[PDB]
């Protein structure tokens with residue numbers, strides 16, 4: 001459940017937070033709108049796990065495996081079993097054009113998987129973009145009744161370390177690994193005013209990655225509906241945003257600030273970027 | 289309103305957050321349960337003001353002025369007019385045994401004051417403690433229908449600097465100025481197991497001050513009801529907690545973690561503690 005009566009935490013023995021010691025001295029851990037930026041060292045997972053288990057939290061995870069991308073599912077799901085929300089209720093939603101071709105991955109207790117058949121678009125750009133419509137079509141069909149939070153990710157990825165309830169919040173985006181140290185002028189936002197995704201050069205907080213966002217079902221419905229409707233306006237006007245759904249996601253999260261931001265620990269590419277000292281954990285990574 | 293549909297923020301030009309620069313290097317700015325700890329430098333008030341104004345937020349401020357403490361009201365209210373939630377809708381609730389003795393303080397537009405008559409208890413300890421019952425009696429009478437958030441403070445205080453929408457969240461407490469640098473064993477929690485306020489020596493996050501807490505009306509009703517009911521159990525058992533309502537507040541916030549914590553900028557005593565370098569702002573201070 002979300003927003004229901006919260007019982008009292010049990011007694012717990014853990015290290016005292018020290019008010020006069022920063023938890024990170026190398027990174028920003030809170031946005032200027034007071035949203036936590038989630039890095040290792042910012043959270044005590046034992047406290048968070050208690051809070052979320054006492055609410056009987058169910059997390060849905062959406063992933064699209066269309067055309068040849070079904071090949072990515074086995075590793076994606078096996079590694080999610082090892083690292084994603086372990087101990088909590090999880091419902092995987094695998095959207096595919098090949099519903100008999102989903103690998104038979106063994107799931108832990110309290111975890112289930114549904115296969116949702118969808119059409120395949122010809123262009124990769126359309127496959128990627130149309131996830132927003134498809135996720136929003138499914139909020140009413142399933143998600144409102146089945147889960148508390150939705151996490152929406154790319155499939156060509158693997159979990160390498162813990163991804164848990166520290167991410168859960170009404171609305172989150174994730175810092176794209178290519179831009180976390182960049183100034184806003186260098187962010188690859190859509191820069192043509194003719195597009196609904198347009199962001200001026202003097203605006204922008206962060207460059208969020210299209211491959212990892214989420215929130216409560218209500219907030220994810222809002223985001224995905226808004227991005228789809230913006231895409232359809234652009235289509236009617238003969239323009240396609242430079243980075244497709246990621247461009248629209250960035251416009252949405254500029255105007256509707258997320259209540260948590262995930263660090264690039266949660267969205268990485270070791271082939272392209274190595275393992276900087278600032279990443280204490282590499283949690284969710286590109287398959288090379 | 290709270291929890292309603294949020295329109296899009298307008299365009300704003302402000303400094304880009306820098307991911308690789310901490311906002312404070314001298315203090316903890318987020319708790320281990322991912323609640324912001326509010327210090328100067330952690331927030332851009334322009335963004336927050338936009339967010340809260342677009343929700344038509346109304347803030348209630350409760351204050352008790354019983355017996356000789358009516359003398360504190362003039363400065364309290366005049367300085368609140370200068371510093372508390374300026375630009376937002378405010379409703380002051382002055383609880384007093386001398387309802388004709390409230391000073392005539394000139395209020396800004398969108399700000400109003402109600403006087404609520406209550407009984408005076410003989411002992412200062414009972415006057416202080418019974419605020420929890422009185423605040424909880426008034427959630428149903430007025431607060432649910434009149435305000436979005438409640439802020440509950442001591443009267444023998446003055447505002448010296450900005451106290452605004454950065455504090456608003458479902459549930460907050462404030463670091464007591466005498467203990468922010470102390471280890472938990474030194475916190476003056478109730479230590480007798482016979483009291484409902486008991487906290488063992490190996491437990492505790494922070495020592496919260498009784499003089500400044502708040503949250504949504506729903507969360508403040510819960511806190512104040514719980515503290516009152518705990519007090520009544522103690523009374524039946526012939527025990528009074530060492531620091532009265534503050535002891536019960538601390539027990540509640542240990543078991544029900546706040547969603548923001550205010551730094552001691554928000555609760556200070558310059559006579560006793562001076563002006564340390566760690567306090568960039570002294571916002572709400574004891575009258576000496």
Ligand SMILES: O=c1ccn([C@@H]2O[C@H](COP(=O)(O)OP(=O)(O)O[C@H]3O[C@H](CO)[C@H](O)[C@H](O)[C@H]3O)[C@@H](O)[C@H]2O)c(=O)[nH]1
Pocket residue numbers: 063064065066067068069124127128153154155156209210211212243244245246247
């Ligand atoms: O034939 C396809 C093409 C895409 N996809 C799905 O769409 C996702 C995104 O497409 P790609 O992985 O092909 O492209 P990128 O890795 O460049 O994706 C990045 O850029 C995209 C926009 O161009 C999206 O924002 C995406 O979330 C972001 O990680 C895939 O992971 C997969 O889930 C398929 O299932 N089949």
Ligand SMILES: O=c1ccn([C@@H]2O[C@H](COP(=O)(O)OP(=O)(O)O[C@H]3O[C@H](CO)[C@H](O)[C@H](O)[C@H]3O)[C@@H](O)[C@H]2O)c(=O)[nH]1
Pocket residue numbers: 351352353354355356357412415416441442443444497498499500531532533534535
């Ligand atoms: O005769 C009185 C006594 C108290 N109060 C009200 O109760 C508040 C708290 O009492 P005091 O200010 O007399 O006592 P302290 O400053 O020591 O208060 C501190 O300790 C208390 C518990 O002992 C409470 O937790 C309080 O919030 C905390 O700041 C006052 O500010 C005032 O609002 C009155 O109105 N009249």
Ligand SMILES: [Mn+2]
Pocket residue numbers: 154156
């Ligand atoms: Mn890809």
Ligand SMILES: [Mn+2]
Pocket residue numbers: 442444
């Ligand atoms: Mn006092």
